[PDB]
Design a protein around this ligand. Structure first.
Ligand SMILES: [Mg+2]
Ligand SMILES: [Mg+2]
Ligand SMILES: [Mg+2]
Ligand SMILES: [Mg+2]
Ligand SMILES: [Mg+2]
Ligand SMILES: [Mg+2]
Ligand SMILES: [Mg+2]
Ligand SMILES: [Mg+2]
Ligand SMILES: [Mg+2]
Ligand SMILES: [Mg+2]
Ligand SMILES: [Mg+2]
Ligand SMILES: [Mg+2]
Ligand SMILES: [Mg+2]
Ligand SMILES: [Mg+2]
Ligand SMILES: [Mg+2]
Ligand SMILES: [Mg+2]
Ligand SMILES: [Mg+2]
Ligand SMILES: [Mg+2]
Ligand SMILES: [Mg+2]
Ligand SMILES: [Mg+2]
Ligand SMILES: [Mg+2]
Ligand SMILES: [Zn+2]
Lengths: 131, 104, 138, 156, 208
RNA sequence: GAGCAAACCGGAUUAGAUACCCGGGUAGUCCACGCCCUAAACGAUGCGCGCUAGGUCUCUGGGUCUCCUGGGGGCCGAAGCUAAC
RNA sequence: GUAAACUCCUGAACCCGGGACGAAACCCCCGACGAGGGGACUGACGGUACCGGGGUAAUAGCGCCGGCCAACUCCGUGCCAGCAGCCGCGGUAAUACGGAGGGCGCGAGCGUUACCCGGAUUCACUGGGCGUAAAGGGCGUGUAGGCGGCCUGGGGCGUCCCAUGUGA
């Protein structure tokens, strides 16, 4: 375009679209589980994947994937949502953090941990170094 | 020092008052192309001496109403409808953009 | 009717050289004539000389090239490998003195047009002035 | 005299063609050979076996070299070169700057024996034409512009 | 707490001999002696042509691991450099080599850097008179780096200087084994240093 | 309002045909004035201007006229361009 | 993996004693009520920092190791349980799931999530485009506006330069 075009009717800056409708910015959410179903995957993969609606503090009723090999969430549990989409589950775009509120970290895990909230073990259960 | 600006009257409808057009000119903050914008200032004619299209100079002064804060020092050419005709012709356009709908 | 008198010349020299013509003619005028004074003192072109054609003044710019080369495509390297217009009309590009360009790391000039004649990045800087940046040649 | 340098494989690919029955891969190696003293050359030959592919390109390499005008440890001056859609652009840099560029242009510049550059990229970041991309750059650097503008011209 | 733990495995990972222990890493036992291959369950297997990043990386962990500094203190100096007039490269080293905990190594007061790090900590060293238990203290041109008066009587230290009787010092330092003192003549220049490094690469690593 | 022809009426083909085929047939296609304004409204390539090899065919004016000079339409092609075409 | 064991050297913590800068004047005296000089009270932080002596080896974790992105085998599991930033990995040999060993990274921290800039020449002024990829307005007429051939002379608004004030 002519520079005397760029002048009248300039350049439109690029607006962003939050892929995380969790009001007022906010990094985590507080929601009350509602229905803890088991959605299937998508085109390429397959199985059963734990997921669960969550009436969010902000007011949104959003779906959330339930990470881990097994979890203890029910129909009234209070949970913390993180953020990050799964690629085999349309509609959900948020994760459930563990070891936070009615949300408990999966047992026996041993590498993830920080991810998957799960106080590491005691290993022989002694001071910071014996066994 | 009080700023002086040089423009072209464009309306003498009011009493002891004259609407002057100041065209300025500057390069783009972000495109450097030269550019022209304009402003209508309202200065006082205590002698009714200045008439349509006279090219005047202007100075800051005691506000003399809502908007008028300048005066008409002295002349710079006692006649040029050439430019007034432009402004008058710009307005004439608006009178016709949107609403009226020449299509109805 | 030309729109940018200079740009015309510059180009007329540009294509001219790409086909290796011996010299090209361009509408005369002080300015262009002063602008070619540089390309000439600087070696991009053997030279120009006021000439007439059909009755209208024109300038014959005798282009300068290099030697024929070895291997395929034997055409001679270019003296004016690049010659652009910077300060176009409706785009006036004036630069301060501290804003003068460096151009092709000194391999090329940049004809300025300071209120002190038509100089080059060098001179203009040397004299201590800036002004409309007419072009950049290398 | 001597005709031996240091070789570096830029990027290899299987290419696959198709026929009744199935597919048929043809390999592609992209090599750069250099002195680190001013000479370097790209090369990309194909073959039914990577090695030959490399070797071949090793031969195509050494055949297309370009004495690069290095001043100290850099390119004498600036240059940006258009290719397919790639636009490599190198900028001479002070000493102690480092190479500073893409896998490809670096593979090339680093054999031409450079040490300090800053590179400009802006399209088809395609290992291949950026390869070539960095070379005509190196082919367009100037030696004697200083001479061409002021020397006579007899027999052209 | 920078590293602290197995060292020679570091020596074995960079593939080059690193002097992180002073003694020993000289007699047949620095591991790089009949076992120069990296540690782990695959140190002996074959290595694959490294990535431009791998080289730049390895070359850094080298420069750094030689001085045993946290990538943190490491970086920030890199920056200091970057900013100072002069060849990023050497200017970097200069400083690196200006660390008290280090200078105490070059002057001999201790068998190697780590030990020197410590001596500085336990207050067995001095700079201009006022002791300094700070490893990262930058020694400036003209600062005497002596041994703590109340330390000049430690066996370990005497042992060290005792064997320096003869060992010349970098042309950028000088010491007085008698008064167990020693000055920092001037920032050692890249040449003066015999590092198996290619700082033209460390540099390149922080250009990513 | 001759011919043609959405819709629609029958005929036939089909596993079924509210379709291809066949025989009719209305709006319509036609003209007047008024309205609609869309389009593969395509060269799918805004307008103007200056510059850069040729050859070949062709329409139209000038020409010392099967040759050169102007305007318009096609073809092939220098340099150059293009992701390629 | 010299990693530990073991040996020797040093000795953060902790204990003893000492412990201050930040404070000098306002007041009072001499002097003249000046200038100057003399005198005296004045700590929250603290009994803290800091100095001197004695002094014990005396917290480590966390992320990753298919490609980008540095780090690999085995065992389990079998399109399940589960990984996932993109590409994807798992349907009975998985370097891509889980544990083990090992390894890379960083270290009182390391991962994560969110948001801003970067990469993004992906709004392009520097630095892009529109025959077929997204992109020429169906055409014209013409308004505001943007742009404007050649020569000389006045202004010198733009533009450039010097000084100076401002730019706490
Ligand atoms: Mg929330
Ligand atoms: Mg734990
Ligand atoms: Mg313990
Ligand atoms: Mg204006
Ligand atoms: Mg008023
Ligand atoms: Mg391009
Ligand atoms: Mg680049
Ligand atoms: Mg440490
Ligand atoms: Mg490493
Ligand atoms: Mg040591
Ligand atoms: Mg009928
Ligand atoms: Mg299209
Ligand atoms: Mg004629
Ligand atoms: Mg024609
Ligand atoms: Mg063609
Ligand atoms: Mg061609
Ligand atoms: Mg003791
Ligand atoms: Mg941008
Ligand atoms: Mg684009
Ligand atoms: Mg003009
Ligand atoms: Mg002026
Ligand atoms: Zn070792």
């Amino acid at each position: 375009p002519t520079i005397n075009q760029l002048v009248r009717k300039g350049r439109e800056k690029v607006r962003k679209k939050s892929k995380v409708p969790a009001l007022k910015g906010a990094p985590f959410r507080r929601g009350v589980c509602t229905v803890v179903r088991t959605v299937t995957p998508k085109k390429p993969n397959s199985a059963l994947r734990k997921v669960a609606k969550v009436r969010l503090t902000s007011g949104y009723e959003v779906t959330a994937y339930i990470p881990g090999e097994g979890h203890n969430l029910q129909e009234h549990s209070v949970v913390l949502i993180r953020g990050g989409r799964v690629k085999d589950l349309p509609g959900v775009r948020y994760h459930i953090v563990r070891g936070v509120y009615d949300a408990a970290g999966v047992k026996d895990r041993k590498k993830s941990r920080s991810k998957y909230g799960t106080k590491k073990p005691k290993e022989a259960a002694k001071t910071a170094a014996k066994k | 020092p009080k700023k002086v600006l040089t423009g072209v009257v464009v309306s003498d409808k009011m009493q002891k008052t004259v609407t002057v057009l100041v065209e300025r000119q500057f390069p783009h903050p972000l495109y450097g192309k030269v550019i022209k914008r304009s402003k209508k200032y309202l200065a006082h004619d205590p002698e009714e001496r200045y008439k349509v299209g006279d090219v005047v100079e202007i100075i800051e002064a005691r506000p003399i109403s809502k908007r008028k804060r300048f005066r008409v020092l002295r002349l710079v050419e006692e006649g040029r409808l050439d430019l007034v005709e432009k402004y008058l012709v710009r307005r004439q356009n608006y009178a016709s953009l949107s609403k009226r709908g020449g299509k109805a | 009717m030309l729109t940018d008198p200079i740009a015309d010349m510059l180009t007329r020299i540009r294509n001219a050289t790409r086909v290796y013509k011996e010299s090209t003619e361009v509408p005369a005028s002080r300015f262009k004539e002063e602008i070619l004074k540089i390309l000439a003192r600087e070696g991009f072109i053997k030279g120009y000389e006021r000439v007439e054609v059909d009755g209208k003044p024109y300038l014959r710019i005798h282009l300068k090239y290099g030697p024929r080369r070895q291997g395929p495509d034997p055409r001679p390297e270019q003296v004016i490998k690049h010659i652009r217009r910077i300060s176009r009309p409706g785009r006036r590009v004036y630069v301060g003195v501290k804003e003068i360009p460096r151009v092709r790391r000194g391999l090329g000039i940049a004809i300025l047009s300071t209120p002190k004649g038509v100089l080059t990045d060098r001179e203009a800087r040397k004299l201590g002035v800036g002004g409309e940046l007419i072009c950049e040649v290398w | 005299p001597e005709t031996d340098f240091e070789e570096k494989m830029i990027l290899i690919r299987r290419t696959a063609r198709m026929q009744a029955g199935g597919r048929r891969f043809r390999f592609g190696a992209l090599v750069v050979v250099g002195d680190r003293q001013g000479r370097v050359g790209l090369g990309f030959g194909k073959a039914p076996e990577v090695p030959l592919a490399v070797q071949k390109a090793g031969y195509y390499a050494r055949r297309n070299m370009v004495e690069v005008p290095l001043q100290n440890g850099t390119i004498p001056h600036e240059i940006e070169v258009e290719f397919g859609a790639s636009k490599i652009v190198l900028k001479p840099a002070a000493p102690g700057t480092g190479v500073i560029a893409g896998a490809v242009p670096r593979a090339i510049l680093e054999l031409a024996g450079v040490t300090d550059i800053l590179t400009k990229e802006l399209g088809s970041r395609n290992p291949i034409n950026i390869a070539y991309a960095t070379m005509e750059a190196l082919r367009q650097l100037r030696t004697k512009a200083d001479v061409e503008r002021l020397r006579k011209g007899e027999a052209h | 707490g920078r590293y602290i733990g197995p060292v020679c495995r570091l020596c074995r990972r960079e593939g080059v001999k690193l002097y992180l222990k002073g003694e020993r890493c000289y007699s047949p036992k620095c591991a790089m002696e009949r076992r120069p291959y990296p540690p782990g369950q695959h140190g002996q297997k074959r290595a694959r042509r490294p990535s431009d990043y791998a080289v730049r990386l390895r070359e850094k962990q080298k420069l750094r691991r030689i001085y045993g500094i946290s990538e943190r203190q490491f970086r920030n100096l890199f920056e200091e450099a970057s900013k100072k007039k002069g060849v990023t490269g050497s200017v970097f080293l200069g400083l690196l080599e200006s660390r008290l905990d280090n200078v105490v190594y070059r002057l001999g007061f201790a068998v190697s850097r780590r030990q020197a790090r410590q001596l500085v900590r336990h207050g067995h060293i001095t700079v201009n008179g006022r002791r300094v238990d700070l490893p990262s203290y930058r020694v400036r041109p003209g600062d005497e780096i002596a041994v703590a008066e109340k330390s000049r009587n430690l066996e370990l230290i005497r042992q060290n200087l005792e064997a320096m009787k003869g060992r010349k010092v970098g042309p950028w330092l000088s010491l007085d084994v008698e008064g167990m003192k020693g000055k920092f003549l001037r920032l050692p220049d890249r040449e003066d240093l015999a590092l198996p490094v290619n700082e033209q690469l460390v540099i390149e690593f922080y250009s990513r």
